[PDB]
Each structure stands twice: as structure tokens, then as C-alpha cells.
Amino acid sequence: EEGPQVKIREASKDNVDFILSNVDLAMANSLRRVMIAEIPTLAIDSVEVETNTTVLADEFIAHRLGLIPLQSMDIEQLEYSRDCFCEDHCDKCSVVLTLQAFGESESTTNVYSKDLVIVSNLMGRNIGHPIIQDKEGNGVLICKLRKGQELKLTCVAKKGIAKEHAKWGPAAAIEFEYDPWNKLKHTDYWYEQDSAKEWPQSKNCEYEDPPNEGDPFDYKAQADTFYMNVESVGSIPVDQVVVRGIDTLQKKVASILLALTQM
Amino acid sequence: NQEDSMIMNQSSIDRGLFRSLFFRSYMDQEKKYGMSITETFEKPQRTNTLRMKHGTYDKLDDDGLIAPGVRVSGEDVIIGKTTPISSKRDASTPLRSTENGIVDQVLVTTNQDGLKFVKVRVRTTKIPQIGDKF
Amino acid sequence: ATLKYICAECSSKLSLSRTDAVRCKDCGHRILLKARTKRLVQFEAR
Amino acid sequence: KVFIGRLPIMLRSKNCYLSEATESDLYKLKECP
Amino acid sequence: MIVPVRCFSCGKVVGDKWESYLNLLQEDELDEGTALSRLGLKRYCCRRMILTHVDLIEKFLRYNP
Ligand SMILES: [Zn+2]
Ligand SMILES: [Zn+2]
Ligand SMILES: [Zn+2]
């Protein structure tokens, strides 16, 4: 079809196990890098307290609230707050939320991301809806309330990336692996007695082939075959962590040609 | 990391890696002279003596105190005490110059003598820095 | 509404004039906290 | 018959209140168990 | 002091999975090992997060206001 190509091994809602071949070592790495930060995400930034009583302080609860993943679908249709012209926050750049809990029950009262309310109108774009991985439908345990522990809030959800702070982290931990049969000599294998006899041969090794001793050192060898597992937060559905990743890796390139022409 | 030091993942500190807290208290009393002359616990402003501190008195209410929950700055008043001599000298106690934070608890009782005792708290979120000890 | 002071134990609203007995009006205890500074406290999510 | 001097008492000791008081009584006495 | 919303090294939403770990052993009589893995704890970074944490919050809830 074209240049470097994909080999999807396993597909799910939070993992894309695939193989990447023909790509430069650098092109593989430059996306793994891009996926971890430079992908737009909506997560609380300006958390405003009305009344708190929880065992956690004003700024304690506030930290954890920004760490709550929220639906980040049409985030490239709501600009960064900064780039808008409003007084701090509005619908163009921010989708504000609220959280109004009180320890009513005689027992413990668990504040969940489900207790959040989208006040600032969403204008017709899938956003600001937390990621509920719970069976019970609860999703993201915020805190615990006993007696008259009242948590009256005002949480503003702005744009952002993990280069700014990991709470906008579109992904978790992307798996990266290449040249399983080390015929490129990429590593001086550690051993007391014997190399492979002490080192465990990888899962992704059932995809390249045995070295065979009756061969020389692969001096002419170069690295391709990039076995990757993409761990999604769920803020962006798996595929887009890869797609909106590749896309935003291109944008920073296209920005350089753009800069070369004003020059 | 050389000659004992070490590198740190900020993208991990961000989640809660070695994130901590630190809470400082403040003490003062409605000190008596005997002849029923007591230091006044309120918000003093110049007038008669003008022997006052330089910080922000403006944050404190009229019981000579900030109610807990307000963001304290650096050298701003946390304790508002006026010294009567024979008017508004002053012996107000402010935030420690170095520090910063938010007010946590504003406690006021009576001592064994029944002198208006104050106990204010300064709640700061100490986060891993570029030269903190571990 | 209108709660200048608060008790630590029983937790009961009070408010008293400059020298009007530092005492909760239920339990003898001289304790008490100064309640919320109503004014909205905006923060950071970091 | 006649009192002589106020002697400080050790926490969780003889005449001290804490010592006897249970986990619940502690979480009530606002003292850490 | 309560479940960290998400792991430190990776960033996988560990937050909710606490109320699901507590029962996974209490109820299902399981070992910690397979109970961590039954939630979805592959690499040790996320494993150490749910396992070696203490919900001190409850001990603080045991007080009055
Ligand atoms: Zn705007
Ligand atoms: Zn009382
Ligand atoms: Zn992890």
C-alpha cells in the first residue's frame, strides 16, 4: 500500500498490541514520546471550594479531582482556555463541572466521579464525562464522608497535555520492544555462567527468527520490528491515542516547514 | 545523580509520588496588667499611637482573626493584638516571612486565668523539589 | 447562616461580643473553632 | 485533709483517664488510639 | 490516606478499583496475588499501588465533625 506498515495483533478498549515495520527506530520512538504527552485532553484545572469538611484538606481533594479522567473526544473543537478571549473560562475553551455531596447516611458516604454535574453547557460535543471503569457504575473514588462532612465545589475543566502535567496523560504505559533475537548486538548480555541460559527469551520473540551460530555478526543489520502495546486511560479510545498521536507528531513537523517559509 | 544524588520522575510526582503536607501553629494571649488593663484582640488602624506592624491587617475579620480557609501570603497579619499604654501601640503577630500556605484551624479558648488564647494553623502542600532530601 | 464561631465537640454556632464569655452554650468547654471564611477559595489541580 | 502541690500525670498511666478508655472512647476523647 | 487517583509510574486509573479489591478477598476468599491481577494489575508499578497502600481516611472518619 505505502511506507512503514502496521500489524494489529490484539485489539481492545485500552490496549492495541500490534507490530510496526519499515519505520526508523526514531519514528517509532518519536510517537511513543508523543503518545505519553502531546495529545489534547480535558481534565479539571481550576477547582473552586465553596465549603469543605472531609478528612482531606481544600488543596488535597483539589489535586485528585484534576487526576479524574473525563471524556476527551471532541477536544480539538474546544480550544485551549488561553487561546480564547474570555475572562478566564467559558464554553469555547472550558466545560465546567460541580460536586455537591454531604454525609447523610449513618454509615460512610463515598464521593464518586458519578456525583459530578456538567453545569457549563457542552454545546453539542462529547466531553466532561468521567471514565467509569466500575461494575457498580460508580467510577473514580474521590473521598469518604461520615457525619456533617459537606463538600460543596466548583470544578473548571480546561484543555492541556502531560508535558504540562500528567493529569492530561492520554495514555498510561506504552510497551516498546524491538530486535528480540539480539542479532544487532544492542546489549552486552549479563551472565555469571551463560547468557540465554540465565536471560528469559521474550514473548515478542516468537515473531523474529533464531540467530543460528553458523552465521557471522549482522554488521549490515539495522533495527525495525517495533512490538508495541498501547495502554489507554480511556479518556481517548485506544485507536485515537495512536491516530491523534501520529497526527500531532506530523503537526510539529509541518510547523517547522511553516517556520522555514516565514524565514 | 553523581557523588550520591538522584534523578526523579516529575510525571510521577504529579500523581502523588512523595507529595506531602506540613502544618504550622501560632500562639498569643489577651495579656493582663492587673489594674484590669488587657491587650485588645481586634483589627487596629493607626489612631493615637500608630505603633503598628506593616503586613496585611485587611485579611483578618473584626475578632482580630482570619477565619480558617483563607490563603495566607508571607508577612501578613494572622493575629491582631493592640497594646494599651499610659492606645493603638500594637503587638499583632503575622505569618512567618519565609512560609506561605492556607489557614487550617482558628482555635480560641480561655487559659487557667481566662485570657483570650489564640491558635491559628498554616496548611502548606510541600511538593518534591529539585533539591529536596530523600 | 451567621456563624462567627463553632464548637469542636457538640458542634454548635455561637458568635459573641469582644469579651462575652469564651464558652459553648450547651457544654461548659471553652474550646471552639472560628468557622468558614465564606469567600470562595479557587485552587490548582496539580 | 489538706492539699499540697499540683503534680503532672503521665499519659496512659495510673490516675490518667486514657489508660482505661477504649478505642471507641479514644475516637470520642479526640485522642489517637 | 485513601486510594490514589491513578498509579505514579504508568497513570492507569487505580482510583475506582479499591472498592473492587476490598471485596475480591473479603467475599471471594482469594489471595492478594490473583486479586491484584483480577482487577488488571499486570506490571508491578500498578500492583504496588493497590497492594501496599493504607486507607487511613477511615481512621480519620472515626472522629466527630
Ligand atoms: Zn473562553
Ligand atoms: Zn459545645
Ligand atoms: Zn503503574
From Swiss-Prot, chain A:
Locations listed in the record: Nucleus
Note: Present with 10000 molecules/cell in log phase SD medium.
Lineage of origin: Eukaryota, Fungi, Dikarya, Ascomycota, Saccharomycotina
Residues of the full protein shown: 3 to 265 of 318
Entry binding sites for Zn(2+): 84, 86, 90, 93
Protein's name in the database: DNA-directed RNA polymerase II subunit RPB3
Cellular-component GO terms for this entry: nucleoplasm; nucleus; RNA polymerase II, core complex
Gene Ontology biological process: RNA-templated transcription; termination of RNA polymerase II transcription; transcription by RNA polymerase II; transcription elongation by RNA polymerase II; transcription initiation at RNA polymerase II promoter
UniProt superkingdom: Eukaryota
Gene: RPB3
GO molecular function: DNA binding; DNA-directed RNA polymerase activity; metal ion binding; protein dimerization activity
Source species of the chain: Saccharomyces cerevisiae (strain ATCC 204508 / S288c) (Baker's yeast)
Recorded family membership: Belongs to the archaeal Rpo3/eukaryotic RPB3 RNA polymerase subunit family.
From Swiss-Prot, chain B:
Residues annotated to bind Mg(2+): 4
Subcellular localization, as worded in the UniProt entry: Nucleus
Residues modified to Phosphoserine: 86
Transmembrane segments: none
Family: Belongs to the RNA polymerase beta chain family.
Reported function: DNA-dependent RNA polymerase catalyzes the transcription of DNA into RNA using the four ribonucleoside triphosphates as substrates. Second largest component of RNA polymerases II which synthesizes mRNA precursors and many functional non-coding RNAs. Proposed to contribute to the polymerase catalytic activity and forms the polymerase active center together with the largest subunit. Pol II is the central component of the basal RNA polymerase II transcription machinery.
Subunit architecture: Component of the RNA polymerase II (Pol II) complex consisting of 12 subunits.
Comment field (misc): The binding of ribonucleoside triphosphate to the RNA polymerase II transcribing complex probably involves a two-step mechanism. The initial binding seems to occur at the entry (E) site and involves a magnesium ion coordinated by three conserved aspartate residues of the two largest RNA Pol II subunits. Present with 18700 molecules/cell in log phase SD medium.
Protein name: DNA-directed RNA polymerase II subunit RPB2
Gene: RPB2
Shown stretch of the complete protein: 834 to 980 of 1224
UniProtKB/Swiss-Prot annotation, chain C:
Zinc finger feature spans (C4-type): 7-27
Alphabetical keyword list: DNA-directed RNA polymerase, Metal-binding, Nucleus, Peroxisome, Ribosome biogenesis, Transcription, Zinc, Zinc-finger
Source domain of life: Eukaryota
Subcellular location per the Swiss-Prot or TrEMBL entry: Nucleus, Nucleolus; Peroxisome
Post-translational modification comment from the UniProt entry: The N-terminus is blocked.
GO molecular function, one term: DNA binding
Residue sites binding Zn(2+) per the record: 7, 10, 24, 27
Gene Ontology biological process terms in this record: nucleolar large rRNA transcription by RNA polymerase I; ribosome biogenesis; RNA-templated transcription; termination of RNA polymerase I transcription; termination of RNA polymerase III transcription; transcription by RNA polymerase I; transcription by RNA polymerase II; transcription by RNA polymerase III
Cellular component aspect of the GO annotation: cytoplasm; nucleolus; nucleoplasm; nucleus; peroxisome; RNA polymerase I complex; RNA polymerase II, core complex; RNA polymerase III complex
Family to which this protein belongs: Belongs to the archaeal Rpo12/eukaryotic RPC10 RNA polymerase subunit family.
Additional free-text comment from the UniProt record: Present with 907 molecules/cell in log phase SD medium.
This protein's name: DNA-directed RNA polymerases I, II, and III subunit RPABC4
Originating species: Saccharomyces cerevisiae (strain ATCC 204508 / S288c)
Upper taxonomic lineage: Eukaryota, Fungi, Dikarya, Ascomycota, Saccharomycotina
Designated gene of the protein: RPC10
Swiss-Prot record, chain E:
Residues where Zn(2+) binds: 7, 10, 45-46
UniProt keyword Metal-binding, yes or no: yes
InterPro entries for this protein: RNA_pol_su_RPB10, RNA_pol_suN_Zn-BS, RPABC5/Rpb10
Any one GO molecular-function label of the UniProt entry: DNA-directed RNA polymerase activity
One GO CC term, this protein: nucleus
Keyword Transcription belongs to the record: yes
Keywords: DNA-directed RNA polymerase, Isopeptide bond, Metal-binding, Nucleus, Ribosome biogenesis, Transcription, Ubl conjugation, Zinc
GO biological process, one term: transcription by RNA polymerase I
Domain of life according to the entry: Eukaryota
Transmembrane segments: none
Chain residue numbers at which the record places covalent cross-link Glycyl lysine isopeptide (Lys-Gly) (interchain with G-Cter in ubiquitin): 59
Subcellular location(s) of the protein: Nucleus, Nucleolus
Oligomeric and partner information: Component of the RNA polymerase I (Pol I), RNA polymerase II (Pol II) and RNA polymerase III (Pol III) complexes. Component of the RNA polymerase I (Pol I) complex consisting of 14 subunits: RPA135, RPA190, RPC40, RPA14, RPB5, RPO26, RPA43, RPB8, RPA12, RPB10, RPC19, RPC10, RPA49 and RPA34. The complex is composed of a horseshoe-shaped core containing ten subunits (RPA135, RPA190, RPB5, RPO26, RPB8, RPB10, RPC10, RPA12, RPC19 and RPC40) where RPA135 and RPA190 form the DNA-binding cleft.
Membership in a protein family: Belongs to the archaeal Rpo10/eukaryotic RPB10 RNA polymerase subunit family.
Other noteworthy facts: Present with 5300 molecules/cell in log phase SD medium.
Name this protein carries in UniProt: DNA-directed RNA polymerases I, II, and III subunit RPABC5
Chain's gene name: RPB10
